[PDB]
Every structure is written in C-alpha cells, then in structure tokens.
Amino acid sequence: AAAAGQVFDVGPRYTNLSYIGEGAGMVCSAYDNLNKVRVAIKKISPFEHQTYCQRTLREIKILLRFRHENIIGANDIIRAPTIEQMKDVYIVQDLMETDLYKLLKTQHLSNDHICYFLYQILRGLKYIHSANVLHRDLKPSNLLLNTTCDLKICDFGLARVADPDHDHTGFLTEYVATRWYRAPEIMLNSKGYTKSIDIWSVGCILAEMLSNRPIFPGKHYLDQLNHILGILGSPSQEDLNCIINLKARNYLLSLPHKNKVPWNRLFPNADSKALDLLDKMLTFNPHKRIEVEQALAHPYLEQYYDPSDEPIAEAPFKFDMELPKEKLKELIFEETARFQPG
C-alpha cells in the first residue's frame, strides 16, 4: 500500500520515495524518519530463481559481518515477520549519489581524485582480503561515491572464501564475473579463488580512471586475453613455466610474439608513480602481482598510507559457495532476524 513507478512498502520508518532503479528488483531513495537523513533502499525479490537466492544470501551474510568505511553496509533490512509472508527483502543503505561507472561517463578525474579513490578502493579491499574473502566482481559500477568523494565497495554476490589450494582448473573454463576486469589466469588455469584476482580488477579500474575508457574491452572470452597480451606483450618463459596446464601453455605458445606497449605511451598524461603501481597490479603472473598491502604502501599513495588507520577484520569468514531454494529462504530469514523488533 505505497507504490513507486511497483510495490515499495518500507514500513512506517521510510517515506518520500523516489526511483533510481533497476539494479539487483529496483532502487529508490527515501526519507528516514528515525535519523531524518535521506537513504537508499534496494528491493530484492529472489525467492523464485534459486541462483538469485544464493547471491542474496551471500551478499546479506557479508554485508552484515563486514564493518568498514569503504564498504557499503546494510543499515536496515526489511522483510515480513514470517517466512510464509516473506516475498521481498529490502536493504537500506547509506545514500550514495553516484558510482564510478556513471562518473567516468562524463567527468575527467584529476590526479588527486584518482589517488584518493584508489587509496579508498584498496583500503576497503584490505579489509575484505583480511577476512579471507574475495570480491571477484570489482568494476567501476560496484564502486559507490557520495558528494564528498567517499568511496564504498558494494555487490558481494559473486564473493567467495579464498581457497588457493583449489584454484587450478582447465583451459577455457567458463567464468561468471565481468569480462573486462577478468585476470588472464581466469582464461587459462584459474577458478578465481585467490586474492590476486581482485588486484587485477583494481588495476583495470586504475587504468580506466586515467583515461576514462576500459583498458581491456574484449568482446568475448578469448578476445579478452588477446587484449591483455596486446598491451602486456607475450609472457616470458618463466611465466609460461608457472602454467603447468598443457592446453593453456600450448595455446599461448601458438600465438605470434607481441612486445609490451609501455604504460607511458598508453597514458602520457599520467603520474609516473601511478604507472609504476599500475604495472605492478597488471602483472601477468599472479604470483608476482602486488598484494593489497604492498599497493597501499606504494609511493603513489604516500599522502594517504597509514596502516594503523587501515583496519583488518576481527576474524576470517566462514563459507559461502553453496542447498535447495527453500532452505536458502530460511537462511535469509534467519540472517535478517536482528532487524526485527519481533
């Protein structure tokens, strides 16, 4: 009994709705009457398809367990008082005006902005990684921004617990995360269960911040690899020897030789410390790729770096990655109980 454009009934607490929609259901802003601030509300309607259930549960479990200035929280979650009556779930969050994807369509960023956004991306990422979680879908639309340049990472639906022991797979194994921000190893021999997959995406985001265009816009699964290799050049023998997978190694060896395009050719207006950090994020071999704490400690970020102000999670995270649709509904109901006066 309160609509927008569908039903969007968010109790007595939240009023003066206004569409911003099509994200997960639909998104509105709304006046919060207990805190008198405007806030964002996302309506989730996932109990039909069993995969949107999994993404929803995963996202709720993470959002509630994580507490960090550069990671979007869930201030409130609204659903029916019973499982029977629960059809929709609404997640209430800090209202963030824009995201980096929308910003970059229209705005050039000064070096000071690039530096600050990157610092905040990596500060959030350090927390995430310290919990043994991988985000796995970092991209400019998953980076929210407010009018005062605060950056918050959102969308933990593809997130997983890190599992480097079980990261190997065969050549051309299908993947779900967004193509342009996929590390080379996803196409070759990785399931994306190590931390280095997120650092690659961050590197892609940096490159995008410096030029306002995706650095590796592959049209489909292997074109992505040829984009990467067209800039980085052919992998060294020693990087090839880290790929044991014969199908992947022989594929790479079949390719004509390509030299590196130097970053300063691609990004002639860029701060050279920015390009050095970029280089180290967009390293072909995931074993040699810089880690989140090394990136924060890089000279480019020296105006911000302060590890005592770069918090870590209080304990490791415990196993997303799995259950029929009816059990999932029940877990979601149980995970959201703390917001019920009930």
Swiss-Prot record:
Database matches in SMART domains: S_TKc
Subcellular location: Cytoplasm, Cytoskeleton, Spindle; Nucleus; Cytoplasm, Cytoskeleton, Microtubule organizing center, Centrosome; Cytoplasm
Main subcellular location of this protein, as a coarse class: cytoplasm
Entry keywords, A to Z: Acetylation, Apoptosis, ATP-binding, Cell cycle, Cell junction, Cytoplasm, Cytoskeleton, Kinase, Membrane, Nucleotide-binding, Nucleus, Phosphoprotein, Serine/threonine-protein kinase, Transferase, Ubl conjugation
Residue sites binding ATP per the record: 20-27, 42
Protein kinase domain span: 14-301
Cofactor dependency: Mg(2+)
The organism's place on the tree of life at top rank: Eukaryota
EC top class, as a word: transferase
Name recorded for this polypeptide: Mitogen-activated protein kinase 1
UniProt source species: Rattus norvegicus (Rat)
Record lineage: Eukaryota, Metazoa, Chordata, Craniata, Vertebrata
